[PDB]
Structure formats: C-alpha cells, structure tokens
Ligand binder design. Structure first.
Ligand SMILES: CC(=O)N(c1cc(O)ccc1C)c1cn(C(C)=O)c2ccccc12
Ligand SMILES: [Mg+2]
Length: 103
C-alpha cells in the first residue's frame, strides 16, 4: 500500500508542476511530425493517472518505469535547448530527486 500512496503523491506533484505542460496529454501524432516513427512507446502523465486510478500498477517500480519513459521519450524527440526539452529536464530532475527522497 505505502508503495502506491507515494506514487499518487509524486504523480500529483508532477501533474501540478509548472514544467508539466508538455506531459499532461499524449502527444498528438497528427500534429507532431515524425513522432509516431521516432517514439515507439509513448507515455504521459494522464496515461499514468488512468492506469493508477484503475489499479493497473503492480509495484512502485512499474510506476517509475512509466515516469522515466516520459523523460526518455522527451530527450529522444526534443532537443535539449528546445522549449519542450527544457521543460522535460526540469521534470526529470524533479522526479528523480523526489523519488530518491523517499526510497
Ligand atoms: C507541448 C505540447 O503541448 N505537446 C503536445 C502536442 C499535441 O499535439 C498534443 C498534446 C501535447 C501534450 C508536445 C509534447 N511533446 C513532447 C512530450 O515531446 C511535444 C514535442 C514536439 C511538439 C509538441 C509537443
Ligand atoms: Mg542521480
């Protein structure tokens, strides 16, 4: 139980983070050229929220893998000096820091 309660805390904190705006919604491949071809396993906070609210996370490690997937995809598709890349570096450092601040 305590494993999944922290997942809720950190996802809520990521959802309300100032830098979360690229990650709240699944990328629309119709509007983002090349996204379908380049990113094999899309992930975003709303997709993690759906899975967490339906109980679909077995452990905290499945949850973190989805979180790290958001930021791996971000760095794969976006330049580090792009607006989205900069937002994702902020969010990745937040997650890694807060996740270690617990375990
Ligand atoms: C910033 C923004 O609003 N995006 C977005 C775009 C959509 O069409 C639908 C939903 C979202 C969340 C984009 C997210 N991107 C990521 C995560 O690489 C992007 C990478 C490149 C361009 C936009 C985004
Ligand atoms: Mg480190």
């Amino acid at each position: 139980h305590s494993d999944l309660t922290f997942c809720e805390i950190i996802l809520m904190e990521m959802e309300s983070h100032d830098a979360a705006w690229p990650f709240l919604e699944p990328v629309n491949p119709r509007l983002v050229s090349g996204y379908r071809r380049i990113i094999k396993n899309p992930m975003d906070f709303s997709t993690m929220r759906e899975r967490l609210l339906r109980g679909g996370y077995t452990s905290s490690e499945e949850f973190a893998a989805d979180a790290l997937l958001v930021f791996d995809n971000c760095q794969t598709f976006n330049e580090d000096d792009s607006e989205v890349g900069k937002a994702g570096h902020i969010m990745r450092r937040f997650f890694e820091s807060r996740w270690e601040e617990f375990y």
